[PDB]
Amino acid sequence: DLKLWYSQPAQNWSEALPIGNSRLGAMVYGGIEREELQLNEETFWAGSPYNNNNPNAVHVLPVVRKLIFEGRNKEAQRLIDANFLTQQHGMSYLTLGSLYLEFPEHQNGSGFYRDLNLENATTTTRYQVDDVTYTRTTFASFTDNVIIMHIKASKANALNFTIAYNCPLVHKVNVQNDQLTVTCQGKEQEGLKAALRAECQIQVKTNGTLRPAGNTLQINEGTEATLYISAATNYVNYQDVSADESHRTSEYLKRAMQIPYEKALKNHIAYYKKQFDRVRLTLPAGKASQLETPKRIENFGNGEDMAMAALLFHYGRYLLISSSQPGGQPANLQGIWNNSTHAPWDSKYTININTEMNYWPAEVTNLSETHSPLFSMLKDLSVTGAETARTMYDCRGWVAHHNTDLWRICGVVDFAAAGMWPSGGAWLAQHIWQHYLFTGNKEFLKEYYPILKGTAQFYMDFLVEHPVYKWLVVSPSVSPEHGPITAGCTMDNQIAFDALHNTLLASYIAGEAPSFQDSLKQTLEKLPPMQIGKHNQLQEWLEDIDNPKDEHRHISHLYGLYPSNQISPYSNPELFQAARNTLLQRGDKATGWSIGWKVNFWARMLDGNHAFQIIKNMIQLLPNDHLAKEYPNGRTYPNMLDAHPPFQIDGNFGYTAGVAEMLLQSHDGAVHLLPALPDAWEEGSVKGLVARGNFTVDMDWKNNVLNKAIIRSNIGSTLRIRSYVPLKGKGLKQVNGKECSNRLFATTPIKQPLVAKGVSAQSPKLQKVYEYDIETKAGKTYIVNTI
Ligand SMILES: OC[C@@H]1O[C@H](O)[C@@H](O)[C@H](O)[C@@H]1O
Ligand SMILES: C[As](C)(=O)[O-]
Ligand SMILES: [Ca+2]
């Protein structure tokens, strides 16, 4: 059960299958008389180097702030829209075009089968024409940095086809020396000129004959043919476009063709398997699980295909591996897969939930390497966003708002109502802190500390005293993406808290001046506390203005519940219950990404049954975008890709991290085994998850109860297990009272929440937990059993 298969070739982009090696991507249709591979390279975007800083903002910031405190929010907003933005609002990721293979004589094909196999990161297309069988194997090589397509007829000399290319961009195609060569111009956008070019080269190994035919390349009388597809651009970094794209493309191709095909395949599969075989979720199958995958998606609701949930979980891991690898660019709104020259929201990096969600799987699902391209981006933003901080706000450190792109802009995007939100940089930076919590790597933390610290330094210079309540607050900002431009947003308070407090914790490891550490504490102590309001809800703003029917897709004020660690049912039961009520008020549906966050939310609520209800709200078929009005509840394409709609990859990755959080939590402050297992999943296993403190964890269960767990300690120190059932095992002390000495999965104290006048704050219903301690040694493995 690790393949997606189909009995008809793709009729549209939502039916085609994604492959990629992080840099090159293809979407594969499977068409019989004509195959299409629509291509992408991760650095092919519109525009040039630029920024969207508006220096007018520094002159106007005090006046904007005065008005907000006077309740004149519209006037402040009109002032923001005129002085804080430019004419450029993030450049669009682009398509690289489509390669077509034309099989004119393959008229009446039968016995058709298409798949994508997650075991080995290859797609297969197979069919009969008369007595002859045809088989296509396609993959984007992790080892040879080219896309490869291998085609085999089962009869001698029976293979004849043409290779051609098209693209919506301005392009040239030339056939010389049996090599098809494409050059592709980048694109002008919002008045910014095009500095990028792409090149693509195709060659073919075959026992048949090769010859040109206009701007196509024709193969005749073959038995096997093997296409080698290379491409690259002139991008080096955000302010350097001087590389030679032709040389780059030639070099990849030359090198890839030195290896024979069977070995090149083996190698690819091996390299992929190192990252992919680390983790498996197993849930029981039925006969239903054998059906083709669009049917599995459609019928998931009826309960007879629990294993499908596991398949979608594995798909997220495949996608992250296939879209994000060390040395490259981070996964954008669409991963690396996009066929437009003006995509939805420019297939950019949206950093008020979206880009962060993409990387939730990285640590917990055992894909730590996939995280690197993001840290790499953070170095860039720590420079370009220091320019933003200085020019616009006259502040030290660095900042980013709610969107950035290949050129690493950090200013205010689109318009104030959604864009005036200076906490994007600070949230992204927390991915540094989490990488440390999960790996324990102190060397990493010291390298990246200046960057993390930079966000804390910005807040210390940007925060201002609220005239009435005296708390330090972030203004002007919004709770993404609704309500007015305002001051004391709960989300900004939670992110500022993490920025300051985790900079502090890191400072004891990195080394710092006592005076800078005392600033951090003095600043934390002045931040606003969280609040329970008149509907027993957690307040999104300072004032008690939450609307209990509002089902807005964003729930930005539960950042603290997830992905942060500020709402614990043990430390703060009353607040936890207010979060619960907030979640009931927002409801279970909305966009694909919204649904993905909610699986994590309900996992942190320790409510497996509700989490599984969210899962059922994602696994519903949207056949394609042409039929969205007719299928308005569909959130998964026949691709198994997530639908906002349209296609947005956030939800695939949010879902995967969600299933993990259902089975394992390590943030508060113990390693919690099966914290949110649905009654639906009566029996199964999971292998390979990671807990903070760098523990790898395997678990299996029967009758809705943990049976056995196997925990490897990758770096030693104390392990604290937490469970709903009592446990036994070698060297397992029970513990009551004193907290654990391991800081990595430890939680952190928040300010006492305030309760509104005449509210009697409800208390949550919690299962009794049993906690145990183990003293562990790096490299060793410990087994735990149930009583
Ligand atoms: O850039 C993508 C957009 O980002 C915003 O944060 C969100 O409101 C939209 O639903 C969408 O995901
Ligand atoms: C206005 As836009 C879709 O280029 O950010
Ligand atoms: Ca990438």
Numbering used by the authors: 21 to 807
Task: Please give sentences taken from the publication describing this entry.
Bacteroides ovatus, a prominent member of the HGM, was previously shown to utilize an extensive range of plant polysaccharides, including xylans. Our data show that B. ovatus has evolved a highly dynamic xylan degrading system that can respond to the different forms of the xylose polymer. Here we show that growth on CX leads to significant activation of PUL-XylL and only very low activation of PUL-XylS, while glucuronoxylan (from birch; BGX) activates only PUL-XylS. These data suggest that the degradative system encoded by PUL-XylS targets simple linear or glucurono-substituted xylans, while the products of PUL-XylL drive the metabolism of more complex decorated forms of the hemicellulose.
The GH95 enzyme BACOVA_03438, although located in an ‘α-L-fucosidase specific family'41, released exclusively L-Gal from CX, displaying only trace activity against oligosaccharides containing terminal α-L-Fuc residues. Structural analyses in combination with mutational experiments revealed that the highly conserved Glu501 acts as the general acid catalyst in a single displacement (inverting) mechanism. No carboxylic acid residue was found at the appropriate position for a general base catalyst, similar to the Bifidobacterium bifidum GH95 α-L-fucosidase, AfcA.
